[PDB]
């Protein structure tokens, strides 16, 4: 049923995800979580994409409640928006220079992996093969 | 290419400055590298339009544009270093004028052609702020009576209005 | 009639334009996901249905306002309007 | 306070002080056309000129708020409403030969060309 | 020590950019990867989405949205015209004026049913006039200071603004076409700029914009710049299927 | 009131010896058509502002047949004639009413106005 | 120091007369004479740029307070 009021509510959550306070962003994130789990399967994925843009920056955070509601928003958003979109958000910071950022991205990618490890098989990038290893998957590009 | 943003307005932001640079032509650089203390605009800036005639006509246009409401001028980046130049060729352009009169000095004001306002076609006179009075001397000497475009030049020190 | 929907093997459908008088083959719009396609179909002038090697069928639609003629790795892209996990490799679609 | 004949001679646009443009049939017994009543402007106390587009697609009128109001003649729906003048917009005139050119005048002392 | 040896084990940003096959990506965050060849191949993969801006910054996420004055929230249209918003504004102003005393009194001798809820007005807003807001597609994270950012890379000539027209002397609106700007004048006079020779000026190197006027007064197109033999300055300054969706519900 | 007229243009006549009442032909629309344009559109932008009355304008009239001139009257006791095309200049100002002018009308040829 | 101002010129004094009267001191580079377009006459003054500054100085020495068209003119360095 939220498939009706999702549009009415988005510009208020984006409003409160551009800062107002810790608790402001903690709560807007909880709202995103529950909207996503409600609107699973009804096509309102453009709106949840838009709100991903605003939730994902809070990924580097410290306060337990804040980062925790953020992670919850990303599991909800994972079922509702699909695991491609979120693997793409999680691509570049897996192997990044800082260890705080490496660790948050491996926390996320772990939770994206545990649930729905089997979709990803068609979502992984193309990672070229150097000298003494083989890394491309020729299985997948047989023509037919 | 390099244009002096003079009367450079304080709050008139370099972003819309470059958007007007584009709305005129090759927006390649809009810069007002300011005081190392203030941050606000420093009265003269460098606007690079990577085409010379582009910057020339963009300057002729964005002069008198009401920057901070005030007319600010795009020019070449006052004890009477202005020279009167008559029998004037009406068939010139403004950057052509700057390059024809800038051979013996800078031009702190492009040649203001005293043309009639009823039409937009001149009667043959102008005045030009050069760099030096000896500059106006040398230029007005080499072009005293000499070969102008269609009506031969006649130049010297300018009157005051 | 004059558009191409190429479908590579891993990235996606990729909409390509043939401008005859300059005789160019130029890109304007592609997809935002990886999709190992096995076969696609046309539903209209802007909508393409795709199968996938892993089970799925999807329908992807160009936004309604595509600057068809012009001159990360793309300019403007298409959207996804349906997503279904059939359950087995779907090897041929057809509008009928 | 303001009446104009339509370009084809068939209709009178009478601005009525009750915030309505009333259409009378100019050749036919001077009967009011109850299907052609334009509402959604405010003209109480003002003599705001009404005019027609040359093709009769549109009706234009100024209001007491300085807005130009543009209705579709066919549906009677207000299509456009923008602030033209700072004060009351008194004159509104469509250019007889030009497809979009409208001239407005107001109690601000300005006359404005729109396209 | 171990840190010093691997720091020296690290390479130059030019080392990277020359090695790599896709050089757009390279940044010193990658040059500082313990596996920069990976890090860069990843960052150059398709469709992947880069880390937010703000891991470097010392300020937290939107504490930068703090300092400047911020407006509260603007409802959706279809809810302003559904007459529950106005209901709520009215009730608000009432109860902000009333004195502590009166709030306690309304709780007691209540104003029961001050305003009955209006149906089909609501149900039609939410079910008949609800509309897609503006959404941002995959990738465009919101960061603080986004409103400031200057906006560039419109090298296009036709790009004009209305304040641009006003403070340059040209027209705003439907006449931004039929108005050749004061720079197209010297485009016609001595040419368009020689780094936008891939730009054609409208009315000077392009044809008449819709219903333009030829003439030499203020408000026209003048002499479309042409050779003495008749060929214009460039270009032409004068001017010489079944998209139905398959599965759809009306 | 003392009747006075101010011409604001330097030249009363064009290069053919014709007054500013002569219907212009350099305009990209035929102002001698009796046929309306095939289809009108809604205006979107302000193109011009005739400034130069010192009080509110009370009526506006286009030139009959062709619309190339505009008469305006104002509470400043002045009537003004303006160009609609070209440089859109104030052509003439008529002075001689002791009080505000309320309305104006051309004759059918536009050679005279009341 | 090759350009000199010469005032007090009689209405008949022209560019050819000025060239003839100043040519004896040395070659002249330019002659500029302000005129009033409403009348078609000069304002009584002109600027002569000679090739040589020494020739201009000699012409200034010999021509200042001299007679030309029956009247005394003024000759000096223009700037």
């Amino acid at each position: 049923m939220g498939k009706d009021y999702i549009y009415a509510v988005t510009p208020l959550l984006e409003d409160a995800l551009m800062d107002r306070d810790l608790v402001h962003r903690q709560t807007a994130s909880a709202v995103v979580q529950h909207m996503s789990l409600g609107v699973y399967g009804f096509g309102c994925e453009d709106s949840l994409n838009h709100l991903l843009n605003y939730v994902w920056p809070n990924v580097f955070e410290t306060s337990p409640h804040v980062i925790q509601a953020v992670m919850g928003a990303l599991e909800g958003l994972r079922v509702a928006i699909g695991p491609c979109r979120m693997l793409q958000y999680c691509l570049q910071g897996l192997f990044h220079p800082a260890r705080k950022v490496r660790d948050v991205y491996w926390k996320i990618y772990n939770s994206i992996y545990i649930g729905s490890q089997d979709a990803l098989i068609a979502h992984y990038p193309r990672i070229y093969n150097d000298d003494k290893n083989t890394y491309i998957r020729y299985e997948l590009d047989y023509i037919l | 290419a390099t244009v002096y943003v003079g009367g450079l307005d304080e709050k008139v932001s370099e972003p819309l400055l470059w958007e007007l640079f584009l709305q005129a032509g090759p927006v390649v650089n809009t810069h007002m590298p300011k005081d190392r203390v203030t941050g606000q605009h420093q009265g003269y800036g460098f606007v690079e339009f990577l085409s010379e005639e582009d910057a020339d006509y963009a300057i002729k246009i964005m002069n008198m544009i009401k920057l901070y409401g005030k007319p600010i001028r795009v020019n070449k980046a006052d004890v009477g270093a202005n020279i009167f130049i008559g029998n004037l060729d009406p068939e010139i352009d403004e950057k052509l004028l700057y390059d024809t009169f800038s051979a013996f000095g800078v031009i702190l004001q492009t040649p203001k052609i005293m043309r009639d306002p009823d039409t937009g076609n001149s009667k043959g006179y102008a005045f030009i702020n050069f760099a030096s009075f000896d500059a106006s001397d040398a230029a007005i000497e080499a072009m005293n009576g000499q070969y102008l475009c269609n009506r031969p030049i006649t130049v010297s020190y300018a009157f005051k209005k | 009639g004059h558009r191409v929907i190429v479908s590579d093997v891993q990235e996606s459908f990729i909409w390509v334009r043939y401008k005859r008088n300059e005789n160019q083959l130029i890109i304007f719009a592609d997809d935002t996901y990886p999709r190992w396609v096995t076969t696609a179909s046309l539903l209209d002038y802007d909508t393409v249905a795709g199968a996938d090697k892993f089970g799925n069928i999807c329908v992807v639609r160009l936004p309604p306002n595509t600057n068809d003629e012009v001159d990360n790795g793309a300019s403007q892209k298409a959207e996804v309007i349906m997503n279904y996990h059939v359950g087995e490799t779907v090897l041929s679609l057809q509008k009928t | 306070p303001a009446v104009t004949l339509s370009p084809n001679g068939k209709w009178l646009a009478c601005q009525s002080m009750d915030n309505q443009i009333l259409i009378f049939g100019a050749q036919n017994r001077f009967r009011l056309n109850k299907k052609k009543i334009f509402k959604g402007h405010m003209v109480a106390g003002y003599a705001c000129q009404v005019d027609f587009s040359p093709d009769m697609s549109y009706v234009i009128s100024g209001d007491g708020n300085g807005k130009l109001n543009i209705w579709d003649w066919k549906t009677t729906k207000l299509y456009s409403r923008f602030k033209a003048h700072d004060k009351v917009c008194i004159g509104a005139v469509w250019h007889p030969h030009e497809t979009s050119k409208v001239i407005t005048c107001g109690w601000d002392g300005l006359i404005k060309l729109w396209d | 020590s171990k840190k010093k040896l691997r720091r020296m084990n690290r390479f130059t940003v030019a080392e990277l950019k020359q090695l790599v096959a896709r050089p757009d990506v390279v940044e010193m965050h990658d040059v500082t990867a313990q596996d920069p060849k990976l890090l860069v191949h990843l960052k150059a993969t398709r469709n992947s989405v880069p880390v937010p801006r703000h891991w470097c910054f010392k300020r937290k996420y939107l504490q930068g949205k703090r300092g400047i004055e911020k407006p509260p929230f603007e409802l959706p249209d279809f809810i302003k015209r559904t007459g529950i918003q106005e209901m709520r504004e009215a009730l608000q102003e009432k109860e902000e004026q009333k004195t502590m005393k009166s709030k306690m009194r309304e709780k007691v001798r209540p104003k029961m049913g001050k305003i009955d809820i209006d149906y089909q007005k609501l149900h039609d807003a939410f079910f008949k006039w609800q509309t897609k807001p503006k959404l941002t597609i995959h990738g465009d994270l919101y960061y603080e200071g986004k409103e400031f950012e200057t906006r560039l890379k419109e090298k296009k000539p036709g790009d004009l603004s209305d304040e641009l027209r006003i403070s340059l002397g040209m027209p705003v609106g439907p006449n931004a076409h039929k108005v050749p700007p004061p720079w197209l004048i010297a485009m016609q006079r001595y040419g368009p700029p020689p780094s936008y020779p891939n730009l054609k000026i409208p009315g000077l190197n392009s044809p008449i914009p819709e219903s333009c006027s030829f003439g030499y007064h203020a408000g026209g197109w003048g002499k479309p710049p042409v050779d003495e033999t008749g060929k214009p300055l460039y270009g032409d300054v004068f001017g010489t299927i079944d998209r139905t969706p398959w599965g759809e519900l009306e | 009131g003392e009747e006075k007229t101010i011409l604001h243009v330097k030249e009363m006549y064009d290069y053919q010896g014709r007054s500013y009442l002569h219907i212009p032909q350099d305009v990209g629309v035929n102002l001698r058509s009796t046929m309306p344009p095939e289809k009108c559109y809604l205006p979107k932008k302000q193109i011009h502002v005739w400034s130069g009355h010192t009080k509110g304008v009370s009526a506006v009239r286009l030139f009959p047949l062709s619309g190339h001139l505009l008469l305006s009257c104002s509470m400043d006791c002045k009537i003004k004639l303006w160009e609609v095309y070209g440089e859109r200049r104030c052509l003439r100002t008529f002075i001689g009413h002791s009080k505000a002018v309320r309305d104006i009308c051309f004759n059918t040829a536009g050679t005279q106005f009341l | 120091k090759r350009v000199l101002y010469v005032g007090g010129l009689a209405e008949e004094v022209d560019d050819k007369v000025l060239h003839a009267a100043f040519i004896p001191f040395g070659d002249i580079t330019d002659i500029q004479i302000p005129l009033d377009y409403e009348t078609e006459k000069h304002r009584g003054f002109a600027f002569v740029e000679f090739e040589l500054a020494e020739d201009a100085a000699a012409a200034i020495d010999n021509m200042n307070e001299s007679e030309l068209f029956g009247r005394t003119i003024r000759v000096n360095l223009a700037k």
Side-chain angles (χ1 to χ4, degrees), chain E residues 110 113 125 133-148:
Chain E
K134 218 192 144 282
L135 305 164
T136 42
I137 59 164
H138 177 37
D140 306 306
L141 311 223
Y142 155 89
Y143 58 97
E144 70 77 11
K146 186 175 183 179
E147 51 293 0
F148 294 87

Tab-separated table of all heavy atoms in Angstrom, chain E residues 106-148, unseen atoms left out:
chain	number	residue	atom	x	y	z
E	106	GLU	N	-10.263	23.350	25.552
E	106	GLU	CA	-10.628	22.554	24.347
E	106	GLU	C	-10.462	21.071	24.700
E	106	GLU	O	-11.315	20.255	24.294
E	106	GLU	CB	-9.857	23.009	23.104
E	107	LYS	N	-9.433	20.738	25.495
E	107	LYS	CA	-9.254	19.328	25.936
E	107	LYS	C	-10.491	18.932	26.757
E	107	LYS	O	-10.974	17.801	26.562
E	107	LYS	CB	-7.966	19.207	26.758
E	108	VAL	N	-10.964	19.844	27.627
E	108	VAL	CA	-12.192	19.707	28.468
E	108	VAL	C	-13.441	19.923	27.595
E	108	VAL	O	-13.745	19.010	26.807
E	108	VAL	CB	-12.148	20.685	29.657
E	109	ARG	N	-14.113	21.090	27.668
E	109	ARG	CA	-15.320	21.226	26.854
E	109	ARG	C	-14.898	21.283	25.397
E	109	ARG	O	-14.779	22.360	24.807
E	109	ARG	CB	-16.113	22.468	27.255
E	110	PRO	N	-14.672	20.130	24.782
E	110	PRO	CA	-14.020	20.107	23.474
E	110	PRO	C	-14.879	20.706	22.373
E	110	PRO	O	-16.110	20.651	22.407
E	110	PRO	CB	-13.786	18.618	23.238
E	111	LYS	N	-14.198	21.286	21.384
E	111	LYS	CA	-14.829	21.688	20.131
E	111	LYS	C	-14.904	20.436	19.265
E	111	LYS	O	-14.093	20.198	18.369
E	111	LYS	CB	-14.051	22.821	19.469
E	112	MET	N	-15.901	19.610	19.559
E	112	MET	CA	-15.985	18.307	18.922
E	112	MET	C	-16.389	18.465	17.468
E	112	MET	O	-17.351	19.162	17.149
E	112	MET	CB	-16.977	17.410	19.655
E	113	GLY	N	-15.637	17.815	16.587
E	113	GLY	CA	-15.852	17.996	15.166
E	113	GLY	C	-15.813	19.440	14.723
E	113	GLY	O	-16.823	19.960	14.239
E	114	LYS	N	-14.685	20.122	14.920
E	114	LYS	CA	-14.544	21.468	14.383
E	114	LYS	C	-14.612	21.445	12.868
E	114	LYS	O	-15.279	22.279	12.243
E	114	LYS	CB	-13.223	22.087	14.842
E	115	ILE	N	-13.892	20.496	12.265
E	115	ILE	CA	-13.866	20.376	10.776
E	115	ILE	C	-13.873	18.893	10.383
E	115	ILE	O	-12.877	18.198	10.665
E	115	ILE	CB	-12.659	21.130	10.179
E	116	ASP	N	-14.972	18.433	9.778
E	116	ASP	CA	-15.088	17.020	9.328
E	116	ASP	C	-14.078	16.784	8.200
E	116	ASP	O	-13.966	17.658	7.317
E	116	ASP	CB	-16.515	16.709	8.868
E	117	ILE	N	-13.406	15.630	8.211
E	117	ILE	CA	-12.401	15.300	7.155
E	117	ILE	C	-13.129	15.205	5.809
E	117	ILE	O	-14.232	14.624	5.775
E	117	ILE	CB	-11.653	13.995	7.494
E	118	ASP	N	-12.512	15.722	4.743
E	118	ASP	CA	-13.157	15.744	3.402
E	118	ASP	C	-12.637	14.557	2.586
E	118	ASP	O	-11.406	14.439	2.428
E	118	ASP	CB	-12.911	17.076	2.689
E	119	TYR	N	-13.552	13.726	2.077
E	119	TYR	CA	-13.176	12.526	1.284
E	119	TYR	C	-13.197	12.859	-0.212
E	119	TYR	O	-13.535	14.001	-0.579
E	119	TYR	CB	-14.103	11.354	1.616
E	120	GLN	N	-12.844	11.871	-1.040
E	120	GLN	CA	-12.804	12.019	-2.489
E	120	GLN	C	-11.994	13.242	-2.863
E	120	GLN	O	-11.268	13.186	-3.851
E	120	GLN	CB	-14.196	12.123	-3.111
E	121	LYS	N	-11.861	14.198	-1.960
E	121	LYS	CA	-10.836	15.197	-2.186
E	121	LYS	C	-9.480	14.603	-1.886
E	121	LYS	O	-8.594	14.588	-2.747
E	121	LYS	CB	-11.088	16.424	-1.313
E	122	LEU	N	-9.350	14.025	-0.698
E	122	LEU	CA	-8.157	13.273	-0.367
E	122	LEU	C	-7.971	12.102	-1.324
E	122	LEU	O	-7.004	12.073	-2.091
E	122	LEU	CB	-8.255	12.811	1.075
E	123	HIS	N	-8.927	11.177	-1.353
E	123	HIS	CA	-8.759	9.971	-2.151
E	123	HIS	C	-8.478	10.296	-3.610
E	123	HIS	O	-7.838	9.502	-4.304
E	123	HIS	CB	-9.993	9.084	-2.014
E	124	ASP	N	-8.873	11.471	-4.092
E	124	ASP	CA	-8.523	11.793	-5.460
E	124	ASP	C	-7.133	12.393	-5.553
E	124	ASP	O	-6.429	12.172	-6.542
E	124	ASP	CB	-9.565	12.729	-6.040
E	125	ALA	N	-6.710	13.141	-4.542
E	125	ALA	CA	-5.316	13.542	-4.540
E	125	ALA	C	-4.419	12.328	-4.584
E	125	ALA	O	-3.657	12.147	-5.532
E	125	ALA	CB	-5.003	14.373	-3.306
E	126	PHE	N	-4.564	11.447	-3.614
E	126	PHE	CA	-3.663	10.319	-3.481
E	126	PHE	C	-3.852	9.258	-4.542
E	126	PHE	O	-2.926	8.484	-4.778
E	126	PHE	CB	-3.816	9.671	-2.107
E	127	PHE	N	-5.011	9.177	-5.187
E	127	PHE	CA	-5.238	8.109	-6.145
E	127	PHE	C	-5.545	8.598	-7.542
E	127	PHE	O	-5.736	7.775	-8.436
E	127	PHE	CB	-6.368	7.212	-5.674
E	128	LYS	N	-5.616	9.899	-7.759
E	128	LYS	CA	-5.935	10.389	-9.088
E	128	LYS	C	-5.010	11.489	-9.571
E	128	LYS	O	-4.868	11.652	-10.786
E	128	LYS	CB	-7.385	10.881	-9.120
E	129	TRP	N	-4.331	12.216	-8.686
E	129	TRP	CA	-3.408	13.266	-9.094
E	129	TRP	C	-2.007	13.070	-8.532
E	129	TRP	O	-1.189	13.986	-8.600
E	129	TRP	CB	-3.936	14.635	-8.678
E	130	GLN	N	-1.713	11.900	-7.979
E	130	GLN	CA	-0.373	11.622	-7.499
E	130	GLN	C	0.566	11.404	-8.678
E	130	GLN	O	0.224	10.738	-9.656
E	130	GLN	CB	-0.379	10.399	-6.599
E	131	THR	N	1.767	11.973	-8.578
E	131	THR	CA	2.662	12.082	-9.721
E	131	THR	C	4.113	11.897	-9.298
E	131	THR	O	4.491	12.178	-8.160
E	131	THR	CB	2.512	13.440	-10.424
E	132	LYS	N	4.920	11.447	-10.248
E	132	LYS	CA	6.324	11.125	-10.042
E	132	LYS	C	7.110	12.373	-9.682
E	132	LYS	O	7.194	13.294	-10.494
E	132	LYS	CB	6.922	10.522	-11.304
E	133	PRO	N	7.746	12.417	-8.524
E	133	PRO	CA	8.600	13.565	-8.208
E	133	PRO	C	9.853	13.530	-9.058
E	133	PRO	O	9.922	12.744	-10.005
E	133	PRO	CB	8.901	13.390	-6.716
E	134	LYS	N	10.824	14.388	-8.795
E	134	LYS	CA	12.087	14.315	-9.512
E	134	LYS	C	13.043	13.421	-8.739
E	134	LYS	O	13.333	13.683	-7.570
E	134	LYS	CB	12.697	15.695	-9.728
E	134	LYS	CG	13.369	15.820	-11.096
E	134	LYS	CD	14.240	17.059	-11.234
E	134	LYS	CE	15.481	16.773	-12.067
E	134	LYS	NZ	16.525	16.057	-11.293
E	135	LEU	N	13.512	12.364	-9.391
E	135	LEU	CA	14.416	11.390	-8.806
E	135	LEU	C	15.770	11.451	-9.503
E	135	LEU	O	15.892	11.899	-10.641
E	135	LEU	CB	13.818	9.986	-8.904
E	135	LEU	CG	12.437	9.934	-8.277
E	135	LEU	CD1	11.644	8.716	-8.673
E	135	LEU	CD2	12.587	10.004	-6.797
E	136	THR	N	16.797	11.005	-8.797
E	136	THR	CA	18.141	10.966	-9.334
E	136	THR	C	18.582	9.526	-9.518
E	136	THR	O	18.490	8.721	-8.594
E	136	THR	CB	19.098	11.670	-8.394
E	136	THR	OG1	18.785	11.299	-7.054
E	136	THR	CG2	18.933	13.148	-8.531
E	137	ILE	N	19.104	9.216	-10.696
E	137	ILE	CA	19.408	7.835	-11.043
E	137	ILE	C	20.660	7.366	-10.334
E	137	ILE	O	21.321	8.140	-9.636
E	137	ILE	CB	19.547	7.636	-12.555
E	137	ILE	CG1	20.658	8.527	-13.107
E	137	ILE	CG2	18.214	7.863	-13.222
E	137	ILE	CD1	21.132	8.129	-14.494
E	138	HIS	N	20.950	6.079	-10.484
E	138	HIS	CA	22.062	5.394	-9.846
E	138	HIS	C	23.333	6.220	-9.800
E	138	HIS	O	23.846	6.644	-10.837
E	138	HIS	CB	22.338	4.121	-10.622
E	138	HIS	CG	23.505	3.351	-10.115
E	138	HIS	ND1	23.804	3.256	-8.778
E	138	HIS	CD2	24.437	2.621	-10.762
E	138	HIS	CE1	24.872	2.501	-8.624
E	138	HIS	NE2	25.282	2.110	-9.815
E	139	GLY	N	23.860	6.430	-8.598
E	139	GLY	CA	25.223	6.879	-8.434
E	139	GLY	C	25.407	8.237	-7.819
E	139	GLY	O	26.440	8.466	-7.186
E	140	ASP	N	24.438	9.134	-7.929
E	140	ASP	CA	24.674	10.549	-7.655
E	140	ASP	C	24.466	10.851	-6.178
E	140	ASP	O	23.524	11.531	-5.783
E	140	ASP	CB	23.758	11.399	-8.515
E	140	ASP	CG	23.876	11.064	-9.979
E	140	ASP	OD1	25.007	11.089	-10.505
E	140	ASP	OD2	22.838	10.754	-10.599
E	141	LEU	N	25.386	10.349	-5.363
E	141	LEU	CA	25.289	10.569	-3.930
E	141	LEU	C	25.102	12.040	-3.620
E	141	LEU	O	25.649	12.914	-4.279
E	141	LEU	CB	26.534	10.104	-3.192
E	141	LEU	CG	27.213	8.766	-3.341
E	141	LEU	CD1	27.551	8.321	-1.973
E	141	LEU	CD2	26.316	7.783	-3.954
E	142	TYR	N	24.316	12.306	-2.603
E	142	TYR	CA	24.198	13.652	-2.100
E	142	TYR	C	25.335	13.906	-1.129
E	142	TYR	O	25.591	13.111	-0.227
E	142	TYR	CB	22.860	13.861	-1.406
E	142	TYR	CG	22.859	14.959	-0.383
E	142	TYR	CD1	22.558	16.254	-0.737
E	142	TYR	CD2	23.154	14.702	0.934
E	142	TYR	CE1	22.553	17.247	0.182
E	142	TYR	CE2	23.158	15.697	1.860
E	142	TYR	CZ	22.854	16.964	1.480
E	142	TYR	OH	22.857	17.951	2.425
E	143	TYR	N	26.008	15.030	-1.315
E	143	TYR	CA	27.042	15.482	-0.407
E	143	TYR	C	26.690	16.897	0.002
E	143	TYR	O	25.850	17.549	-0.618
E	143	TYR	CB	28.415	15.446	-1.061
E	143	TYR	CG	28.453	16.294	-2.290
E	143	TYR	CD1	28.937	17.581	-2.249
E	143	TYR	CD2	27.973	15.819	-3.486
E	143	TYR	CE1	28.951	18.359	-3.360
E	143	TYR	CE2	27.985	16.592	-4.603
E	143	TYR	CZ	28.476	17.856	-4.536
E	143	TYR	OH	28.481	18.621	-5.667
E	144	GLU	N	27.363	17.387	1.048
E	144	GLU	CA	27.135	18.766	1.563
E	144	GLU	C	27.918	19.761	0.697
E	144	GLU	O	29.078	19.457	0.360
E	144	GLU	CB	27.567	18.854	3.029
E	144	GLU	CG	29.069	18.761	3.227
E	144	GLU	CD	29.835	20.029	2.892
E	144	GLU	OE1	29.185	21.075	2.692
E	144	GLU	OE2	31.079	19.969	2.833
E	145	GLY	N	27.335	20.933	0.422
E	145	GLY	CA	27.994	21.949	-0.424
E	145	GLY	C	27.683	21.749	-1.899
E	145	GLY	O	28.287	22.455	-2.731
E	146	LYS	N	26.761	20.831	-2.205
E	146	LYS	CA	26.341	20.521	-3.599
E	146	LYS	C	25.711	21.766	-4.238
E	146	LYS	O	25.983	22.021	-5.428
E	146	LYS	CB	25.346	19.357	-3.593
E	146	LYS	CG	24.937	18.843	-4.968
E	146	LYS	CD	24.052	17.616	-4.908
E	146	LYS	CE	23.698	17.072	-6.276
E	146	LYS	NZ	22.851	15.860	-6.181
E	147	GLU	N	24.941	22.529	-3.455
E	147	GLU	CA	24.239	23.752	-3.932
E	147	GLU	C	25.254	24.788	-4.436
E	147	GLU	O	24.969	25.436	-5.463
E	147	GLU	CB	23.373	24.330	-2.809
E	147	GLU	CG	24.117	24.518	-1.499
E	147	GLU	CD	24.551	23.229	-0.822
E	147	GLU	OE1	24.279	22.148	-1.381
E	147	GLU	OE2	25.159	23.310	0.264
E	148	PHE	N	26.407	24.902	-3.769
E	148	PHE	CA	27.455	25.890	-4.143
E	148	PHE	C	27.941	25.635	-5.577
E	148	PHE	O	28.141	26.617	-6.318
E	148	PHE	CB	28.629	25.805	-3.165
E	148	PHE	CG	28.310	26.224	-1.752
E	148	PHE	CD1	27.797	25.317	-0.840
E	148	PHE	CD2	28.524	27.528	-1.334
E	148	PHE	CE1	27.504	25.703	0.459
E	148	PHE	CE2	28.232	27.913	-0.035
E	148	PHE	CZ	27.722	27.001	0.859
